[PDB]
Design an enzyme around this catalytic site. Structure first.
Site, PDB file in Angstrom:
ATOM      1  N   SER A 197       0.841  -1.269   0.000  1.00 58.30           N
ATOM      2  CA  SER A 197       0.000   0.000   0.000  1.00 58.30           C
ATOM      3  C   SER A 197       0.850   1.282   0.000  1.00 58.30           C
ATOM      4  CB  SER A 197      -0.974  -0.075   1.230  1.00 58.30           C
ATOM      5  OG  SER A 197      -1.911  -1.126   0.937  1.00 58.30           O
TER       6      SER A 197
ATOM      7  N   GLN B  19     -10.856  -4.647   0.394  1.00 56.00           N
ATOM      8  CA  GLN B  19     -10.325  -5.340  -0.768  1.00 56.00           C
ATOM      9  C   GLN B  19     -11.382  -5.400  -1.859  1.00 56.00           C
ATOM     10  OE1 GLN B  19      -8.745  -8.852   1.835  1.00 56.00           O
ATOM     11  NE2 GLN B  19      -7.306  -8.669   0.120  1.00 56.00           N
TER      12      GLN B  19
ATOM     13  N   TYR C 130     -10.287   2.766   5.547  1.00 55.25           N
ATOM     14  CA  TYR C 130      -9.178   2.416   4.668  1.00 55.25           C
ATOM     15  C   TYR C 130      -9.581   1.309   3.698  1.00 55.25           C
ATOM     16  CZ  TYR C 130      -4.363   1.250   3.402  1.00 55.25           C
ATOM     17  OH  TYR C 130      -3.199   1.012   2.720  1.00 55.25           O
TER      18      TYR C 130
ATOM     19  N   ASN D 151      -8.719  -0.425  -0.447  1.00 59.64           N
ATOM     20  CA  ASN D 151      -8.148  -0.477  -1.790  1.00 59.64           C
ATOM     21  C   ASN D 151      -9.165  -0.041  -2.837  1.00 59.64           C
ATOM     22  OD1 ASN D 151      -5.731  -1.449  -0.788  1.00 59.64           O
ATOM     23  ND2 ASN D 151      -6.179  -3.589  -1.290  1.00 59.64           N
TER      24      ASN D 151
ATOM     25  N   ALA E   1       1.789  -3.714   2.989  1.00 65.40           N
ATOM     26  CA  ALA E   1       1.854  -5.150   3.202  1.00 65.40           C
ATOM     27  C   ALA E   1       1.294  -5.881   1.994  1.00 65.40           C
ATOM     28  CB  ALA E   1       1.084  -5.561   4.460  1.00 65.40           C
TER      29      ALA E   1
ATOM     30  N   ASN F 232       5.972 -10.098   5.883  1.00 66.78           N
ATOM     31  CA  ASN F 232       4.954  -9.209   6.440  1.00 66.78           C
ATOM     32  C   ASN F 232       4.920  -9.412   7.950  1.00 66.78           C
ATOM     33  OD1 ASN F 232       2.762  -7.605   7.043  1.00 66.78           O
ATOM     34  ND2 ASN F 232       1.242  -8.987   6.139  1.00 66.78           N
TER      35      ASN F 232
END
Ligand code: CL
Ligand code: NA
Length: 358
Positions: free
Chosen positions: A61, A117, A147, A149, A315, A340
């Site tokens: 990210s 996601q 938050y 994507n 990550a 990670n």
């Protein structure tokens, strides 16, 4: 490297690597504007390939900071406005819930509950349209930060439409090339695969898989040298020859929303420096960083504040990254690892190093 930097880096990163069982790691410290590099361990355990300054890591990210700056660049070119509705650039979305969602909301995760996601079953442009068409918001736009994507990833895809370029072409020509990031890739070329480190998840070597909007949200791979130069550029934007790129970086570090102690930029996140280390350390835990939190709009958006802690975590399955810098001090750090490991451990190490060097 200055002795002060060697001392603190080896005091801090060496215990971190052993405690977290990190196979390979690269660190860049930017001190008074100049970079200093450190490498540990292996990019490929089985073949005993060591990490070098040419090793490519998955940024995860942290890629969002490139997307934010690329969007900022488009704003500065007059191609888009953050207040523009999403439907100006994707008319097939025209609907009640989407007419009130702007590019700002997408870029800052305030659209109203877009998921973390993009579903794995979204694999075509039609799948993606239907995904956003049938999305049920949980909150009104501009009230909650979640938050995601699927939020900033869509911002990146739409921000490049007026240019007539693909996202990758726009990123290459408007960001990577002007900044001479010659070993930073969305799609690793065949000749560069030899430098592509393996990530490690539960003792298994892994590379991130293709996904919808991956290039916009988490699909950038880079070396420790290019990432150091990315920090240099974000530390000293006025040294950049291209006005719109300088302004895009300044726009990406501007403060549009406030949640508690943190301010949301475009990709970048900011706190006032000096920071309470416990705030950013605990705040980087996913139980907190991925939770929905209310936002207050900042009007007008605060121009990039020099006395800021600017940072972003990253990550993938087998990689973990971190970038933080303090423009007022010309000071920053990049941490790239092919495992990670928990964000709080990254932030703790980074703050200890930068606080010692201020
Ligand atoms: Cl090296
Ligand atoms: Na709003």
């Amino acid at each position: 490297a200055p002795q002060q930097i060697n001392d603190i880096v080896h005091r801090t990163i060496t215990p971190l690597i052993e405690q977290q069982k990190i196979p390979g790691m690269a660190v860049a410290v930017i001190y008074q504007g100049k970079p200093y590099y450190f490498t540990w361990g292996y990019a490929d355990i089985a073949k005993k390939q060591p990490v070098t300054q040419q090793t490519l890591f998955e940024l995860g990210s942290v890629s969002k900071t490139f997307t934010g700056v690329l969007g900022g660049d488009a704003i500065a070119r007059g191609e888009i406005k953050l207040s523009d509705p999403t439907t100006k650039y994707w008319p097939e979305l025209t609907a009640k819930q989407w007419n009130g969602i702007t590019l700002l909301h997408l870029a800052t995760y305030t659209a109203g509950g877009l998921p973390l996601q993009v579903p794995d079953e979204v694999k075509s442009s039609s799948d993606l349209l239907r995904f956003y068409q049938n999305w049920q918001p949980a909150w009104a736009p501009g009230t909650q930060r979640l938050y995601a994507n699927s939020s900033i990833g869509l911002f990146g895809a739409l921000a490049v439409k007026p240019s007539g370029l693909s996202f990758e072409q726009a990123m290459q020509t408007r960001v990577f090339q002007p900044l001479k990031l010659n070993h930073t890739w969305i799609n690793v070329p065949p000749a560069e695969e030899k430098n592509y480190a393996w990530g490690y998840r539960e003792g298994k070597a892994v590379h991130v898989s293709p996904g919808a909007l991956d290039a916009e949200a988490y699909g950038v791979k880079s070396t420790i040298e290019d990432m150091a130069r990315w920090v240099q550029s974000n530390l000293k934007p006025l040294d950049i020859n291209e006005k719109t790129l300088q302004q895009g970086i300044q726009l990406a570090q501007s403060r549009y929303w406030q949640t508690g102690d943190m301010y949301q930029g475009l990709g970048w996140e900011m706190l006032d420096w000096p920071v309470n280390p416990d705030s950013i350390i605990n705040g980087s835990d996913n139980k907190i960083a991925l939770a929905a939190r209310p936002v207050k709009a900042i009007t007008p958006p605060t121009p990039a504040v020099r006395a800021s802690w600017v940072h972003k975590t990253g990550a993938t399955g087998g990689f973990g990254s971190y970038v933080a810098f303090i423009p007022e001090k010309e000071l920053g750090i990049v941490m790239l690892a092919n495992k990670n490991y928990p964000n709080p451990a990254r932030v703790d190490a980074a703050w200890q190093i930068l606080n010692a060097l201020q």
